[PDB]
Amino acid sequence: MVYSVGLTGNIASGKSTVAEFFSELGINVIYADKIAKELTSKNTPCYQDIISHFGSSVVLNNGELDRKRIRDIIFSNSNERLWLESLLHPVIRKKIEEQLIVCTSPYCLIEIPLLFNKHHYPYLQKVLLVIAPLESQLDRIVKRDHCTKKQALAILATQPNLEQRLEAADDVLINESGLSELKAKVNKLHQKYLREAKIKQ
């Protein structure tokens, strides 16, 4: 079916902005992470399973999931990242496939996690990995987390090793100047995706 490009990024790399730029070019962007929040709404099955599995600590008083706490758990505990990915993957897949059927752009962009299981995303034509320099990440994390540079630096020391994902990506968008250069690179990628979608079946 539809020519699809998976969008990934390391933390504070700018990938959301990248998605916005593709969107502005008329490209339908599917956000796996938004789907995930949707499908873990109050009293969905996944919501119940997450809470029963992790227990009451991940339930805020207003009954929504403690998504921050669940991230902390999941980034520190790989077995749990996998449990969670495997719980949600079936329902996420289905919601993605629906959106792919009614996709109106020449290709689709699908924002997926940095360490995505290809086997859950076998349908991708390309993988785009966005990355930003350490400095940039640090400046970004500090504005967003309001932490020391040393904490940001600690936050990043924990970041997953990229070298395997780098090798896997078909394109790597190095987000290392300003928004303006970022846009220009997205246009070049866009033109690349149009050309390949045009000539590949």
Ligand X SMILES: Nc1ncnc2c1ncn2[C@@H]1O[C@H](COP(=O)(O)OP(=O)(O)OP(=O)(O)O)[C@@H](O)[C@H]1O
Residues binding ligand X (CB under 6 A): 9, 11-17, 140, 175, 178-179, 182
Q: Least distance in Å: CB of 43 to ligand X?
A: 27
Nearer to ligand X, 108 or 111 (CB): 111
Residues contacting residue 77 through CB under 8 Å, at least 6 positions apart:
none
Nearer to ligand X, 24 or 97 (CB): 24
Check the annotation: does 14 bind a ligand: yes
Q: Least distance in Å: CB of 102 to ligand X?
A: 25
Check the annotation: does 23 bind a ligand: no
- Which contacts of 163-166 are long-range, i.e. CB under 8 A and separated by 24 or more positions? 165/8, 165/114, 165/115, 165/129, 166/129, 166/131
Check the annotation: does 44 bind a ligand: no
Nearer to ligand X, 98 or 135 (CB): 135
Separation CA 49–CA 135 (nearest Å): 39
Separation CA 170–CA 8 (nearest Å): 11
Q: Least distance in Å: CB of 142 to ligand X?
A: 12
Nearer to ligand X, 65 or 132 (CB): 132
Residues contacting residue 57 through CB under 8 Å, at least 6 positions apart:
66, 69
Residue stretches of the annotated binding site for ATP: 12-17
Residue stretches of the annotated binding site: 12-17
